[PDB]
């Protein structure tokens, strides 16, 4: 029974699992290994939150909560696939009814006016945003493209947009009054708790959070995005973006940042469609429009207004799209813009792609154009500017020659930003915010203004240490230079720098090129070594940890999904993430139309080949070490014979690869002698998958082209899905009888 948790999630990954999971299930079966599932998807996660509204047969164990515990225990061994960080819009909203609709009976959202609505909104809120990962991630990240993959990438280059030195593209960020510029850190001394309180000009005081425990050596910082400063910023960047003749695009993270970014998002959606939303201030107010949900929310709330009233609004909305620069578009043909849904454009992915595509993003028409990427803050806006100003001055990197920038990132215990939500408040009135402790000593204090966004972030000592170690560790094992991206300007990074400088003096530094630089300098020192073809380990915080693992990997491997991501749980556990990517919404869009799934499952093949080992090593299991030693191999054969997903209908799909994995794996096993047993109870298969390869492949491709219907999206009809994902009836019957 030794457990290995394969998590069930949301979109592409989700579908992929109906195909790869059974396979995985047949190989680990005869080696006394238990591969169980846990439903952490968006839908399941909700269906599990309101047991009271559901009936006996529609309930479903609360797995997030279970995994949450499993993560702190030593025998943890979890294979974690990407999952949706729901955004109030169609995300939280649409799946809620994807349920009720024809299914169950949960309940509704937004502006609560009744004790029932408040109790409910309060519970759903905990469900939207980044709820899974912060929990599971009880250790520090270590992402890195495995040689083979880098080597595959080098000989099978993914297209790269040509770069022009006279490009218009660039990144736009505020210059004053923002989180970056507002920072203020403090080093917690004694184990206690702090109170976050507002002191209004009117002498009164409002509590925002009374008790927030702080450990010794913990680092806490507070900053604030100024509403009117942001307002004055976005207003200028639009205006100017019109002169430049460029597309306006917003790169925020209104997904993980469940609290502040949707707010910044709306102020944008506000200062843009202002004339139209000002002309209809009340009509929207009635139907209850929520700008923080994108202009998209407007379009969906008005369908209830008189047929002619609608036309008026829409007709006026168009008048704005004529008075203002064209917005980059999420989907050019359906009109869906960058300002339609909070989570269509998420900075960590939006940018890498936008850089790749010659620094352009699809416009209203349907072609690519230079863009003005708006990254409001300054903490990580820089890093993208450098990379952007590098391309137009040296050309696109060559997948065939460029190096690699791994990333030993700090995240353990909801490190930094990743856990500031419950400490981010929208200021209720002009005043001053003060963070005090148990005695009453004033730790932090930052002036504020109504509408402003104030937050407090905390980085814990234990995590910073486990961090610094792993950093060195990698530095050694590869023997590559390794930089800490820590900006002295930031009162936070500053105190974290003290930590690092003092902890390296606890390990062996001899013969290692370890050094600390600003994300700005660091991106330069990196992009330098990179183009000439040299590697450079990236040791960074939690936010950069993502940005980069998504950035660099994309440039060199085409996909972040295409790499290794291991999370060494700080309690002998093992969090084995699939890829540095997320679900692939568009990947489902194609499947439900053409019957093609271009989702690459190499992330998982690595993840499996990763946990199968952790298993065998931490236990008395040789068999584990063998089916993982082989899996490692069959993977190789995947990259060597190009049995990875094509792009358009016709060649290979997903179970096509899943098939080769299955094929090459069976053979790899039935051709070894480390364990005669496996070799024997895998030959029956090995010589069946080769014989029916030509046919199976055919049976599979024999399902491409036509449309697919799975009765849903967030909570599909499992039956219909299995049959769509497991077409080849011959591959199936050649699996059950192992
Ligand atoms: N759990 C996590 O760690 C995690 C991380 C990030 C995002 N997410 C969530 O995932 C969703 C997607 O966010 P997003 O808009 O930034 O899109 P995304 O899917 O993360 O963007 C990466 C893009 O690269 C390609 N790609 C990603 N994985 C691939 C794979 N396995 N094989 C082949 N190509 C792959 C796809 O584009 P092509 O059309 O070019 O193939 C995809 O649109 C969001 O709801 C987000 O909240 C979860």
Swiss-Prot record:
Entry EC no(s): 1.1.1.42
One Pfam family recorded for the sequence: IDH
Cofactor descriptive note: Binds 1 Mg(2+) or Mn(2+) ion per subunit.
Example of a GO cellular component annotation carried by this entry: cytoplasm
Principal EC category: oxidoreductase
Biological process terms in GO annotation: glyoxylate cycle; tricarboxylic acid cycle
Keywords: Cytoplasm, Glyoxylate bypass, Magnesium, Manganese, Metal-binding, NADP, Oxidoreductase, Tricarboxylic acid cycle
Record localization: Cytoplasm
Annotated NADP(+) binding sites: 83, 85, 133, 583, 587, 598, 600, 647
Molecular function GO labels: isocitrate dehydrogenase (NADP+) activity; metal ion binding
Cofactor: Mg(2+); Mn(2+)
Catalytic activity, reaction form: D-threo-isocitrate + NADP(+) = 2-oxoglutarate + CO2 + NADPH
Assembly behavior: Monomer.
Function, as annotated: Catalyzes the oxidative decarboxylation of isocitrate to 2-oxoglutarate and carbon dioxide with the concomitant reduction of NADP(+).
Homology family: Belongs to the monomeric-type IDH family.
Description of its domains: Consists of two distinct domains, a small domain (domain I) and a large domain (domain II). The structure of the large domain repeats a motif observed in the dimeric IDH. Such a fusional structure by domain duplication enables a single polypeptide chain to form a structure at the catalytic site that is homologous to the dimeric IDH, the catalytic site of which is located at the interface of two identical subunits.
Name by which UniProt lists this protein: Isocitrate dehydrogenase [NADP]
Organism name: Azotobacter vinelandii
Gene: icd
